[PDB]
Design a protein around this ligand. Structure first.
Ligand SMILES: OC[C@H]1O[C@H](O)[C@H](O)[C@@H](O)[C@H]1O
Ligand SMILES: [Ca+2]
Length: 754
């Protein structure tokens, strides 16, 4: 067969063909259910499956490649072929995907000066070798060799990382050298950045979300390439969740409207995610703002939910896609759901306290990261002894990646979270030889932007601060606590209760006479991870919004089953249970879910704006130069009205421009104040202005208080910076509220009055 880029169309075996693809991810779906999920995608109206290849899933240790069982990507593609569906493969080497390090293997970071997603010779050689392995698995499944693979993506959304055409060209060449020479190669990006890395000989595709202004997404592309076929390579069907935040949803009605608009113009798309599944085990990622780890669940509000079930969105999409079939044809029947069971209360009566079950220590004079000790995943304990002190001191940990508990002679003093930028602990007076323990749990490595440079453990150093000065702390005992099931199983379990909330493994067995999917209730538990019959189910955290872990019935057995829970901070009750429905929407954070509280009223009365302006109407980036340089710690944008004359303001992204006229780093930014936020009907929290996601936005309240203009957002830059201008991106939809018109900008060194 053939697949070709034609004149305003794709051609499948010489005939016009509109790609209607479903994104599903083989590691996020138990292998026993691959067929069921593919059949769900076919019944929805799709003709193609789109998938990433996840490098770190196949080469978790250097030189050791695995493509068996759950990792059998060729078997996955053949299953799609057997069900009459084409495949698009996106082999990376970086895939983002809310997945550990964006698919990159942690062991790259053993080279401390490595450069990632650039032509670093060590990185590039490992990429070459990995792609070659993918080629041996998949090149013979190109449509041109009798298989079903129709296109291959080169890299992934490089426009959101940098500008490096020689890099992308070399990746393209490595994809070809691996054997992918028979089908079109393409690169994806946003409508705002695709030109930066666009190569003459690749197809250019665009990614955007439910509700986007479709014409705006493709207009510039058609000025450059009047005859290119148009494809949305990721049409976001929903969104992912962050630990501590609200469960995300997106409108089915809006999705269908955009899908219809594309299909009425024969525009191709791949729906991301069509079924998301679960980031099982340690494989979940982390992204912006700051460090924001993503939930274990990848339900995504996709049409096919986490456990493979029909949703109202599925039914709306199917109703639409049923009208776009070659004449005569009807959609296949929707597969039956996989049965569910409830599992009665499981009492976790056996426990092995972590600090009483430690491995052999490595002695290290200096702090080093976990990768320096040949550890990629899990937790790491750093232990030392301290000198006598009659006065209190401060312990400075620089920096804990990601969630550290500090103990003194076994008594917990504090918890330090990277989500909160924490690194300081007050120590009481010390006796000579007092034992300091810093247990650092590593969550996923960041999967987006420059966050992929994510070394775990303590990144640099530990210091003691007294009135005398600051002293580096040396002479450590280091204990690797790996995620391997074998490590969790090999512990001295005893019938015991956790009086002191110490980190511990908990074990129980339970009988089952009939099997089905279930949802393990973690509401009683603190933070940690779970194994069921050896299978690593994923991470949990009491802050939510996710409170249940999906447990596939194919990982349960008749007769005796085993559950082990690693719980870091102690459960409120040492019991769990299996529910027939998940809990995905229960937050239990510290403080109100808002950037304004009682008694806060921003007062601009004695402030003079740096700039007053008017934004243009409609969609797309706007860049503003102030014609001067201002040293800034705090930035306030005061929106005065909107283009529609209504009471709401919204912002998708804000950047501030430095002395060189380019965006400053937002790594350390903080929203100090937003006058109003919608957090009930949607998750339009104010940090959405710096998550590097053009599909997410801050929006003022509309569901209850619905306050009028003026509206304001105040940002702490986290450091003093010389600012020359700023950039504003409104929400991506057409015809919606909150398109700011008149505005003022204020820049200060001292705090605003709030
Ligand atoms: O879900 C958000 C989405 O963002 C980008 O489009 C990436 O290419 C995807 O891998 C995914 O991370
Ligand atoms: Ca955003």
């Amino acid at each position: 067969g053939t697949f070709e880029v034609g004149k305003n169309t794709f051609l499948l075996n010489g005939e016009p063909f509109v790609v209607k693809a479903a994104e599903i991810h083989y590691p996020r779906i138990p292998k026993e259910y691959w067929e069921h999920r593919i059949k769900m995608c076919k019944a929805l109206g799709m003709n193609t499956i789109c998938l990433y290849v996840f490098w770190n899933f196949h080469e978790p240790e250097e030189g050791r490649y695995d493509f068996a069982g759950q990792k059998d990507i060729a078997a996955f593609c053949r299953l799609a072929q057997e069900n009459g569906m084409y495949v698009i493969v996106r082999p990376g080497p970086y895939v983002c995907a809310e997945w550990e390090m964006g698919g990159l293997p942690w062991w790259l970071l053993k080279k401390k000066d490595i450069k990632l997603r650039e032509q670093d010779p060590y990185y590039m050689e490992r990429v070459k070798l990995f792609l070659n392995e993918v080629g041996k698995q998949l090149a013979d499944l190109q449509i041109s060799k009798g298989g079903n693979i129709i296109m291959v993506q080169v890299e992934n959304a490089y426009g959101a990382f940098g500008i490096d055409k020689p890099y992308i060209s070399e990746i393209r060449d490595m994809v070809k050298q691996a054997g992918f020479t028979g089908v079109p190669l393409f690169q994806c990006d946003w409508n705002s950045n695709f030109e930066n890395n666009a190569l003459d000989d690749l197809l250019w595709t665009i990614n955007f979300g439910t509700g986007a202004n479709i014409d705006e997404q493709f207009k510039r592309l058609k000025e450059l390439r009047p005859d290119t076929p148009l494809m949305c390579s990721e049409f976001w069907s929903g969104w992912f969740d962050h630990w501590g935040a609200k469960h995300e949803t997106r409108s089915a009605e809006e999705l269908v409207k955009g899908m219809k608009e594309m299909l009425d113009r024969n525009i191709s798309f791949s729906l991301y995610m069509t079924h998301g599944g679960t980031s099982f085990g340690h494989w979940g990622g982390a992204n912006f703002p700051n460090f924001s780890p993503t939930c274990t669940s990848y339900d995504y509000d996709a049409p096919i939910n986490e456990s493979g079930k029909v949703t109202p969105k599925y039914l709306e999409v199917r109703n639409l896609l049923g009208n776009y079939l070659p004449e005569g044809e009807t959609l296949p029947e929707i597969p039956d759901s996989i049965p569910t069971i409830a599992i009665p209360t499981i009492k976790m009566t056996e426990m092995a306290v972590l600090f009483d079950n430690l491995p052999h220590p490595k002695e290290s004079e200096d702090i080093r990261t976990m990768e320096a000790f040949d550890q990629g995943w899990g937790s790491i304990l750093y232990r030392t002894s301290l000198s006598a002190s009659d006065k209190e001191q401060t312990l400075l940990i620089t920096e804990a990646h990601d969630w550290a508990q500090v103990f003194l002679n076994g008594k917990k003093l504090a918890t330090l979270s990277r989500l909160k930028g924490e690194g300081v602990v007050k120590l009481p007076p010390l006796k000579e030889g007092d034992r300091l323990d810093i247990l650092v749990e590593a969550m996923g490595r960041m999967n987006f932007g420059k966050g992929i440079y994510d070394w775990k453990g303590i990144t640099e150093k530990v210091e003691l601060q007294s009135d005398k000065g600051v002293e580096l702390v040396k002479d450590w005992q280091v204990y690797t606590i790996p995620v391997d099931y074998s490590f969790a199983r090999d512990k001295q379990y005893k019938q015991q209760e956790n009086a002191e909330n110490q980190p511990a493994y908990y074990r129980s067995t339970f009988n089952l006479n009939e099997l089905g999917d279930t949802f393990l209730n973690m509401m009683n538990w603190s933070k940690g991870m779970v194994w069921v019959n050896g299978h690593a189910i994923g991470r949990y955290w009491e802050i939510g919004p996710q409170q249940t872990l999906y447990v596939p019935g194919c990982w349960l057995k008749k007769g005796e089953n085993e559950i082990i829970i690693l719980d870091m901070a102690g459960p409120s009750k040492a019991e769990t249970e299996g529910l027939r429905q998940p809990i995905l929407d229960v937050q239990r954070g510290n403080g109100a879910y808002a950037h304004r509280k009682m008694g806060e009223n921003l007062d601009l009365t004695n402030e003079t704006p740096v700039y007053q302006g008017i934004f243009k109407s409609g969609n797309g980036w706007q860049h503003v130069k102030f014609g001067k340089k201002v040293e800034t710690r705090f930035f306030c944008l005061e929106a005065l009205n909107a283009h529609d004359g209504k009471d709401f303001a919204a912002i998708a992204e804000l950047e501030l421009l430095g002395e060189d006229g380019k965006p400053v780093s937002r790594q350390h930014w903080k929203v100090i104040y937003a006058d109003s936020e919608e957090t009930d009907a949607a998750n339009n929290i104010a940090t959405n202005v710096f998550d590097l996601q053009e599909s997410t936005f801050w929006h003022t309240n509309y569901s209850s208080s619905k306050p009028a203009f003026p509206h304001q957002i105040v940002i702490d830059l986290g450091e003093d910076k010389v600012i020359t201008g700023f950039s504003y991106l409104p929400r991506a939809e057409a015809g919606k509220t909150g398109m700011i018109k008149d505005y003022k900008v204020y820049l200060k060194m001292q705090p605003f009055k709030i």
